[PDB]
Design an enzyme around this catalytic site. Structure first.
Site, short mmCIF file in Angstrom:
data_model
loop_
_atom_site.label_atom_id
_atom_site.label_comp_id
_atom_site.label_asym_id
_atom_site.label_seq_id
_atom_site.Cartn_x
_atom_site.Cartn_y
_atom_site.Cartn_z
N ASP A 35 0.82 -1.20 0.00
CA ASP A 35 0.00 0.00 0.00
C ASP A 35 0.86 1.26 0.00
O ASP A 35 1.37 1.66 1.05
CB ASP A 35 -0.88 -0.01 1.25
CG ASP A 35 -1.80 1.19 1.34
OD1 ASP A 35 -1.95 1.88 0.33
OD2 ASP A 35 -2.38 1.41 2.43
N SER A 199 -0.85 15.70 -11.90
CA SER A 199 -1.13 15.36 -13.29
C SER A 199 -1.39 16.63 -14.09
O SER A 199 -1.92 17.61 -13.57
CB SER A 199 -2.34 14.43 -13.34
OG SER A 199 -2.79 14.19 -14.65
#
Length: 330
Positions: A35, A199
């Site tokens: 994770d 992004s």
């Protein structure tokens, strides 16, 4: 040193991925959920409340000649999905794909929430976010990656998750045969303890690319792609019959649909998520309403590039002094 381990979907929907991890001496192999959105290595154990164990493999520290109680240390964690676990702490030898760390903090669960009990395939978590998020008190502990880092050939790990198929976690090297084209690297902020990046925009299907900054985290421990409501609405508007259902808990769409792809930007590069990756199947057995793999982050408080996005790429988690993230197509 390096390590290389195969990671395998737990079910037919790629809800999560498990990776075998050797703990203790002689080795006890547990299948852990790696994770990159948390920083605790915790396991089901001989200390876990018996009624909360249902099929998991447990770590038994009393059977490990290298286990030592970390006296006075406790831990307690809550995850974004509302699940939780807590317990005490041992140090022991931990190996992943041939890479060994001695003195790793292995957090032994005394209690786990229902979602963990009900998932027989996950024997615990191995956190790969920054150690500043580790929950051990009163002495915070380091992640497996942080402990391994100095010994690694290069201070990196890579995630190469499969779509309905196994993939690979590598430590200490970049497998240049595992991706196509070039890797595009992008800046990381560690201010919140995550692999947080920005992004450069998105496209829906064959549509034009929208240049827009989307801050979010690369999180292998989250199944879906959670993005701003504007972006998610633009995606689902291209699917006839798709709608957000408060009763179901997100966007659903007719199972008869063909889903468009979703593209996200990494610098000037583009990663394309095929439409099929966005299908999470019937909301309940036999239903003709299907659950979407792109959902709104509104009210999470952070955008999350979970498995839906990451499995479309070869992803480099560069833990050099100035960390960065790399993405390549594959």
């Amino acid at each position: 040193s390096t390590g290389s381990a195969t990671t395998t979907p737990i079910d037919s929907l790629d809800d999560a991925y498990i990776t075998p991890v050797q703990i203790g001496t002689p080795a006890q192999t547990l299948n852990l959920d790696f994770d990159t959105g948390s920083s605790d290595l915790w396991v089901f154990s001989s200390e876990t409340t018996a009624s909360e164990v249902d099929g998991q493999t447990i770590y038994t520290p009393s059977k490990s000649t290298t286990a030592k109680l970390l006296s006075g240390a406790t831990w307690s964690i809550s995850y974004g999905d509302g699940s939780s676990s807590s317990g005490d702490v041992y140090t022991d030898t931990v190996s992943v794909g041939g890479l060994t760390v001695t003195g790793q903090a292995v957090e032994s669960a005394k209690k786990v929430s229902s979602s963990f009990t009900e998932d027989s395939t996950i024997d615990g978590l191995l956190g790969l976010a920054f150690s500043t998020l580790n929950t051990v008190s009163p002495t915070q502990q380091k992640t497996f990656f942080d402990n391994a880092k100095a010994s690694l050939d290069s201070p990196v790990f890579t995630a190469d998750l499969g779509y309905h198929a196994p993939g690979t976690y590598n430590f200490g090297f970049i497998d240049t045969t595992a991706y196509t084209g070039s890797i595009t690297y992008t800046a990381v902020s560690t201010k919140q303890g995550f692999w947080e990046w920005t992004s450069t925009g998105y496209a829906v299907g064959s549509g034009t690319f929208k240049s827009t900054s989307i801050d979010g985290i690369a999180d292998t421990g989250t199944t879906l792609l959670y993005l701003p409501a504007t972006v998610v609405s633009a995606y689902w508007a291209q699917v006839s019959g798709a709608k957000s259902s408060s009763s179901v808990g997100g966007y659903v769409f007719p199972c008869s649909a063909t889903l468009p792809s979703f593209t996200f930007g990494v610098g000037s590069a583009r990663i394309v998520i095929p439409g099929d990756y966005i299908d999470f199947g019937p909301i309940s057995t036999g239903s003709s309403s299907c659950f979407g793999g792109i959902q709104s982050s509104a009210g999470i408080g952070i955008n999350i590039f979970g498995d839906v996005a990451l499995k479309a790429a070869f992803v480099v988690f560069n833990g050099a002094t100035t960390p960065t993230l790399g993405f390549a197509s594959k």
